[PDB]
Structures are given as structure tokens and as C-alpha cells.
Amino acid sequence: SRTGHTHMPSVVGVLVFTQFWFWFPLSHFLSLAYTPTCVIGLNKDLKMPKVQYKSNCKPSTFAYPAPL
Amino acid sequence: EFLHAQEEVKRIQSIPLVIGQFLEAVDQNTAIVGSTTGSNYYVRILSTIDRELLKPNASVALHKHSNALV
Amino acid sequence: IDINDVTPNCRVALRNDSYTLHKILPNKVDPLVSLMMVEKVPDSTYEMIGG
Amino acid sequence: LIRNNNTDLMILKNTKDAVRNSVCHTATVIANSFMHCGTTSDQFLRDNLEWLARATNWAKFTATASLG
Amino acid sequence: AVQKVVVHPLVLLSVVDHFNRIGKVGNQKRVVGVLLGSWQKKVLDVSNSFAVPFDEDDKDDSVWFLDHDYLENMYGMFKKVNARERIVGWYHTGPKLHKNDIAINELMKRYCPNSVLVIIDVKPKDLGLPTEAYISVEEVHDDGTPTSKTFEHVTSEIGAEEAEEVGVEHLLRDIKDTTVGTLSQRITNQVHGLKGLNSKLLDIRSYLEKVATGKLPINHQIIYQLQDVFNLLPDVSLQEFVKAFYLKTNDQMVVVYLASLIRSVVALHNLINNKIANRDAEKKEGQ
Amino acid sequence: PAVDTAEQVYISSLALLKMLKHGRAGVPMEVMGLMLGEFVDDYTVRVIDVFAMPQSGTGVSVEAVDPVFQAKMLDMLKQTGRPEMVVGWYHSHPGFGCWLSGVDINTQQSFEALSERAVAVVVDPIQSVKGKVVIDAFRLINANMMVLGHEPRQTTSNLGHLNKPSIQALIHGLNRHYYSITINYRKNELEQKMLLNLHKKSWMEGLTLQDYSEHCKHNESVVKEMLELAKNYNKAVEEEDKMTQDPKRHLEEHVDVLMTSNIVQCLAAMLDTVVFK
Ligand SMILES: [Zn+2]
């Protein structure tokens, strides 16, 4: 997890995905190993307000791959 | 495993081999032979068959199936 | 293999059961002629000849 | 994920074009599933109904799993 | 008589499979079959076998139902499949004999004059072969003792056709040993030899204990062989032998010394080459 | 429904040994037999044992089955305690490859008609040189499925692949009329130990000593050879280091053999002197 705790869904998903050599349908278990790389700000009302996060780095070391 | 592979090579250098005349050496570890069956083949030489002694038109035993010079 | 290297009267190797040409071998030479070219040069020299 | 669903479809289109075998077919299905996981966007599967319909036996199992 | 019997891997596997299937369907101490083979001098070649239906009363110890009709039918069909394999004996997968063994060997002698029992122990041991061979001989004991129709041991061995060697080797490819003497394996073989010698000596000592106390009678052939063994024990404290022994040990040790010296010199050459290579690489990297 | 490229035929140790024996015991005549086995669920064909067929002279075909012999011996094997169906047939191809010919295809079609899971196995005893068992299972591809564009066999897992199909089988139509099933072997620990008993050495040979005269002769011979290699290796090192392998390698092999043989016999002699008094 983000705090260092082992992510049980993620480890289970990776193991079962690795167990696709014997059964392709289990190859989808890797979905459990997908974690959104999101930082989401919530205020007291538990609704997402329009905030502007500020990262001090070049806009090419973390940008989406360009369409080719 | 290395010992096993050595033993396998020593085995493929087996007993029921077929006589033939090594005609010439094309490259390293490959040469042309003419088997006493009356046909000429482009076969592969095993390793360390004394290529110094392996002179053109030399009596040599051939693998019965692959015709390799062994 | 490129065809252009496959000239008439040249030896070629053929795969088993498919007779597919997969190598160009040394040109065939009559054994009597082949054992007629000099491989090991004599040891005589122009310094061994006088007059 | 839905707000940021910056997925690329041309690469998947190229894979689909290059595919010939059922193995690669299910591979493309699963890769689409991975590239669309948590995005709820099945645009590729709703566009290539003929391709998706060329599946059979456990390939249909895998395609439905990709949907999930 | 028969001096040797060589059983085959196919026979061993068939016996094991027969016992397994019988003990899976039901429960029985023994399972019985016929052994088919050929003779070459007094060397039987047990190259095949087939199970026969057979059950007995383990309490009575004298009632059994070996199926002669089944035996002959199977023998005929095996003759049809292969002809150079005539009934040469029978086998039962019992670790120990029974009072029924003589009777069943009498039954089998109708199909073979020199009928031989082969006890093939499905339980796998670690010192000896899984087959023990017995031939029923009944003769007036020159000993002068009452004579009873009993078995006599026959030398047994395991041999294989080439078409069986290929299968055996393929099946054992994963757990096979090298077909060459590597020093570790040779030392291990010597240790196993000591183990086997100790086990055999222990068996002989236990038999001597039993015969001495009185549980068993004195077997004159056993005692003769033991006497000959003790006659055959060498004398290693003899001076003329100690001197030759030291001479040979010194010869072997000088050969070993030369070998080790050569090996050390070669290793030094290898390290010289490695040091030079490292020097060259670091100089090139620096420049 | 579609058989996938994951089914395996589990040939027992006894079945394989019987197959090879029959093949090399009736070469060159095409030997044949039935497979007393079991289809377990959909991916398993357990060939528990085989069942030789008498040589019928008319090659290998349905005419060679001799059904009366089949029924009689199957009934008697059941009596023995071996109640297994006939999961296909085996027949040898002595030296001319491991595939199916037209008659083989017809026979396997008949077997599939009996039950559409039977596998036709082929063993080539001639090229089954010890160390390499050239055996292969097969089943036919329905004429409709191939033309329909659908693959002959489903592919749901990576199991089943990892096998390189033979060039002979390709040129004889491996995938156009049939397909090669993967052969697995069911080896029990007890069976493996029984197999080991074949060449298992005796404690005698473990504790025995090489002839001493022969040992001395061998040591002298190898030491002379190692002397010659030492001279060669000296010249090689000198020339290479003056202008800046086979001698070193051969010398290492000779030193290794000398050390192992001499040490083994010395220790065997020590053990004998202690143990036998
Ligand atoms: Zn055939």
C-alpha cells in the first residue's frame, strides 16, 4: 500500500495471473493488482472540490505517452 | 549434467555404425562423405575426430540414421 | 541462398525428404586432379641453384 | 479513472490487424481489458463486434471476463 | 537343474502393477502369476509374466484355488503373440514362503519340468535385488536325515533386453546417476559396500544366534560355507604383506602427488592469466 | 465442443515397456496392440497397460484386430482384476518415422467411431536408440473443421505446447489430417526403485579392488601420456607468452582421472585391511 502495508488483493492478483500458464481465464486476475496512481482531495462534505495541485518538475518525466 | 552430456556423445559414437569414405572437408565440423550404400551425403562431423588424421578419401564410420561422421 | 551463386556444374546440398537446396559446396573435382595440386611447397630455393 | 481515461486505441487496432490466431485473439482481448480496467469503457469491444464474435468456447469466457 | 535365473524389468514392473491392482480392488497378502521365459544352457531368462486368479484360506494354510484353466488360456494367447516364450515358472509377491508354495510348485511342474518360483518383493529394499529364486528339489538327504520336498535357492540376477534398457533409462532419466566414476560417487559406493557387508554379517550373526540357542536346526551347508569363509579370511599383519602394501601405497601416493602438483601449477597459470586480464581491463578503462 | 491443446496421454511405465518390447520383438513386421486405459474427464487419457495383438500378416489394419482374441483376453484380464476400457491402439513404425499413413488414419477413424477420444500411438523401435524414446500420440482432425477455418484443437492454456513437431510428421501431414497429443509418463516411486534395481551395483563391486597389475599398468600409461602433454603444454605456454587450450585441457583431464583412480583404490585397500580383520 501507500503506507507500506502489503496489499493482499494485489499479491493475490499477481499470483493468480502468474498462474495463467495453466489457465488463460485466470489471466484477468491481474486486475486486482491495478492501483490508481491518484491523489484525490476531499473536503468535510465528502465531495471532491476543484483544487489545483502543484508539482515542481518538468512536464515530460511524468506525462502520458503521446499518440503516435 | 556435463557428465551426462559427455556420456550421450560417447553413446552416439555407437557400435552399429556404417562404413563410408570421407571425401573432403567442407568447413569446420562438417564434411562430405560417400557411404558404402552408394550415395554421397553432406554430413556433420562430431567433435575431436583428429581432423589432422581426417584426410580426404579416408575410411570412417557413419551414424546409421543421421549419417553423421562419428 | 541467392540463386545467382548457383552456377551450372556446382555441388549443392539438399535437405532430406524435401530436397531443398540449402548450401553451395566446393566445386566437384576429379580426385586424381585434386590430389595433383601442390599443398606443401618443396624446400628448394633459388639459392640452391648455381650457374 | 473515467475522468482520466486517456487510453490509446491505435496500438490496439494495429495488434488486432496483425492478429491471425485464436491465441493472439484472446491476447488482444485481455490486453484491451487491461488497458481499460476500471475505466468502464468498452469502446473497442463495442466497435469490433465481428472480431469479438469470432471467439469460441473458453475464448468467450475470456471476453466476458475482459468486460468485467 | 538351473544354475542362474535373470529376471527382466518388464517382469518386475508387471508384477508390481499386478500387486497394486489386486490390492486396490481388494486386500490380499500375496498375488500369483506365471513367469514366461527361455533357456540358454542352465540360465533361465524370465522375460515376461502374467497374473492368474488365485485366493486361499490364510488360516487353513493348505486350501488355495490357482486357476489352471486360466493359466493355460493365457499361456496359449501369449504363445500366439510370441512363440519363443514357454512357461518357465511362477511368481508370488509374498515376502515369505508358505506351506502352499510346494503344492503350487507341484501344480506348475505339470506345465514345466524345471518349474522355478520367483518371489518378487513389491516392498522395495536397498541392499539386494527384489527377486529370490527357488527350485523344488526332493532327494534322499546324504545327510541321513528325513527328507521332505522343499525348495533350494537359485542364483538370481536382473538383466534387460535393449528395447527394455531404452525404456528403463528413459523412465530413470531424471534420477539417474552418471555412468562414470566421479570421486564422490566412488567414495559413496565404497560406503554402501561397507553398509552391505555389515548387513550381511549381521544376518549371519542372527542366524548363528538362533541356531546356537536352538530355535533352528543346524544346516550343514550353511555351516560348511561359514567354515570356508573363516578359512578364507586373510592375514593382514603378515610382514611380507605389510611391506608390499606400503610399497603399493607409496606408488599410488607418488602418482597422486604428481597429479596434484600438475593441477596446482595449472591453477597458478590460470590465475596469472586472470591477473593479467584484470590489469589490461582496468588500464583500458582508465585510459 | 473442441478438444484443446492441453489433453495428455499418461503412458504408464508398464505400458511403455510393453510397447517397446513388442516393437523390437517383431520388427520389421508392423506390430499392433490395444490400450487398456481410461479417459478420466476431458484432458486425461490414462493408458494403464497395453495389449499385444497376434501378428496377422496383413500388415496393420482393422483386419488385424482379430476381435475374438480381443474379447477373450479382455474378459480374462477383467477376471485377473484389470477392468479397463480400450482407449485406442498402438502400432510400431520400424524406422520410417512416427506418424500415420492412410491405413492408420482409417483404423484410427474406426476407433474414434467406437469412442471419439481414442488416441493412436506410434513407436519407432529402430530410432528408439537407448536414451531417446521416439513415441508419439495422435488423433484425427475432422474434415469439416479444418475447411471451416476453425483450428483443429482449442488452445485454452500454455500446456500442450513446448513440443517441436517432427519434420517427418509435417511432410506426412501432421496438422492437416491429425494432431500430435502430448505424452506424459506416470512414474511411481516404487516403480522407479524397481527400475533402479536393474543396474544397481552390488556391495561386492562397491568394496572390491581393481587388479593391481592392471592398475600399475594404467598409472604408468597415463603418467607417460601426461608427461607428453606436459612437454606440449610447456612449449605452448612458452610460445604463446613470447608471441604475446588443448594441452592444458587434456592435462587437466589426465590429472583428474589419475587422482580419482589412485585415491579410490587407496581408500578401498585401507577399508579392506580394516574391515576384513
Ligand atoms: Zn501405420
- Sequence-distant (≥ 6) Cβ neighbours of residue A21 within 8 angstroms: F157, F158, F159
What value, to the nearest 5°, has the Cα angle with vertex C1 and ends B69 and C7?
90
Burial E27-43, CB ≥16 within 10 A → b, else e: ebebbbbbbbbeeeeee
**What does residue C36 show for φ and ψ, rounded to 5 degrees?**
-105, -20
**From ligand 1's centre to the CA of F169, what distance in Å?**
13
Nearest Cα of chain F lies from the Cα of C35 at a distance, in angstroms, of 30
3-state secondary structure at position E143: coil
- Sequence-distant (≥ 6) Cβ neighbours of residue E256 within 8 angstroms: F258, F259, F262, F263, F266
Domain membership flag for residue F114: yes
3-state secondary structure at position F261: helix
Residues B57 and C31: beta-carbon distance below 8 Å? yes
What DSSP element (H or E) covers C33? helix C31-34
Residues of chain B with a CB closer than 8 angstroms to some CB in chain F: 8, 11, 14, 65
Domain membership flag for residue F63: yes
Chain F (156-175) residues lying within 8 Å, Cβ to Cβ, of chain A: 156-159
Residues E85 and E36: beta-carbon distance below 8 Å? yes
Cell of A39: 491523489
- Sequence-distant (≥ 6) Cβ neighbours of residue E81 within 8 angstroms: F52, F53, F54
Scanning chain E, the segments in alpha helix (DSSP H) are: 9-25, 68-81, 100-108, 162-171, 183-213, 220-232, 239-286
Cell of A48: 471532491
Measured between alpha carbons, how far apart are the two ends of chain F, in Å?
75
Residue D11, judged by CB atoms within 10 A of its CB (0-12, 13-18, 19+), counts as: middle
Domain membership flag for residue F2: no
Cell of E180: 562414470
Residues F268 and E249: their CA atoms lie apart, in Å, by 11
Domain membership flag for residue F76: yes
Nearest Cα of chain F lies from the Cα of B6 at a distance, in angstroms, of 13
Residues F97 and F70: beta-carbon distance below 8 Å? no
Q: What are the DSSP calls for B10-64, one per residue?
A: HHHS-SS-EEEEEEEEEETTEEEEEETTS-EEEE-B-S-S-TTT--SSEEEEE-T
Q: At residue C12, what is the residue type?
A: V
Please count the structural domains in chain F: 2
Give the Å distances, CA to CA, from F87 to E56, E190, F57, F119. 34, 48, 24, 7
Evaluate whether chains F and D are touching (3 or more beta carbon pairs less than 8 Å apart): yes
What DSSP element (H or E) covers E137? strand E131-137
Domain membership flag for residue F20: yes
Residues of chain D with a CB closer than 8 angstroms to some CB in chain F: 21-23, 56-58
Cell of E92: 508370488
Does the distance separating the beta carbons of F159 and A24 come in below 8 Å? no
Instruction: Please give the residue range of the domain that contains residue F189.
Output: 8-196
Nearest Cα of chain F lies from the Cα of B14 at a distance, in angstroms, of 10
Nearest-Å Rg of the Cα atoms of chain A is: 18
**Torsion on CA atoms C36, C39, C45, C51, rounded to nearest 10:** 10
Q: For residue E135, which of E118, E120, E158 has the smallest C-alpha distance?
A: E118
**From ligand 1's centre to the CA of F8, what distance in Å?**
21
**Neighboring chain F residues of E14 at a CB cutoff of 8 Å:** 14
Please say which residue of F133, F168, F196 terminates a domain.
Answer: F196
The answer to whether the Cα torsion of F134, F138, F141, F146 is positive or negative is: negative
Experimental method: cryo-EM
Domain membership flag for residue F192: yes
**What does residue D55 show for φ and ψ, rounded to 5 degrees?**
-80, 160
DSSP E strand stretches across F29-173: 32-39, 44-52, 85-92, 120-123, 135-140
Instruction: Specify whether F138 is located in the same domain as F235.
Output: no
Cell of F215: 592398475
Instruction: Specify whether F23 is located in the same domain as F125.
Output: yes
User: Position of cell 552418471?
Assistant: E178
Instruction: Specify whether F75 is located in the same domain as F127.
Output: yes
Q: Is C19's Cβ below 8 Å from some Cβ in F?
A: no
E97 φ/ψ sector (left φ>0, alpha ψ -120 to 50, else beta): beta
Domain membership flag for residue F12: yes
Domain membership flag for residue F277: no
Instruction: Specify whether F137 is located in the same domain as F65.
Output: yes
Residue F28 preceded by cis peptide, ω within 30: yes
Residues B24 and B27: their CA atoms lie apart, in Å, by 9
Instruction: Specify whether F104 is located in the same domain as F183.
Output: yes
Residues D30 and C37: their CA atoms lie apart, in Å, by 68
CA atoms within 13 A on the CB side of B30: 9
Instruction: Specify whether F166 is located in the same domain as F233.
Output: no
Instruction: Specify whether F92 is located in the same domain as F146.
Output: yes
From the list C13, C31, C34, the residue facing B42 with the nearest CB is C13
Instruction: Specify whether F187 is located in the same domain as F238.
Output: no
**From ligand 1's centre to the CA of F60, what distance in Å?**
6
DSSP state at residue E235? -
3-state secondary structure at position B6: helix
CB atoms under 10 Å from CB of E175, counted, come to: 12
Scanning E26-152, the segments in alpha helix (DSSP H) are: 68-81, 100-108
Instruction: Specify whether F126 is located in the same domain as F234.
Output: no
CB pairs under 8 A between D and F: 16
Q: At residue E42, what is the residue type?
A: K
Q: What are the DSSP calls for F107-145, one per residue?
A: HHHHHHHH-TT--EEEE-TTT--TT---EEEEEEPPHHH
Q: How far is CA F82 from the centre of its chain?
A: 25
**Neighboring chain F residues of C18 at a CB cutoff of 8 Å:** 167, 171
**From ligand 1's centre to the CA of F111, what distance in Å?**
14
At what angle are helices E162-171 and E9-25 packed, to 10 degrees? Answer: 60
**What does residue F86 show for φ and ψ, rounded to 5 degrees?**
-105, 95
Measured between alpha carbons, how far apart are the two ends of chain B, in Å?
22
Q: Is C33's Cβ below 8 Å from some Cβ in B?
A: no
Tell me, in Å, the resolution of the deposited structure: 3.1
Q: Please enumerate, by residue number, every residue of F annotated as part of a binding site for Zn(2+).
A: 91, 93, 104
Please say which residue of F158, F173, F196 terminates a domain.
Answer: F196
User: Position of cell 568394496?
Assistant: F207
Q: For residue F174, which of F182, F163, F164, F165 has the smallest C-alpha distance?
A: F165
Q: For residue C25, which of C40, C41, C6, C46 has the smallest C-alpha distance?
A: C6
Please say which residue of F196, F219, F237 terminates a domain.
Answer: F196
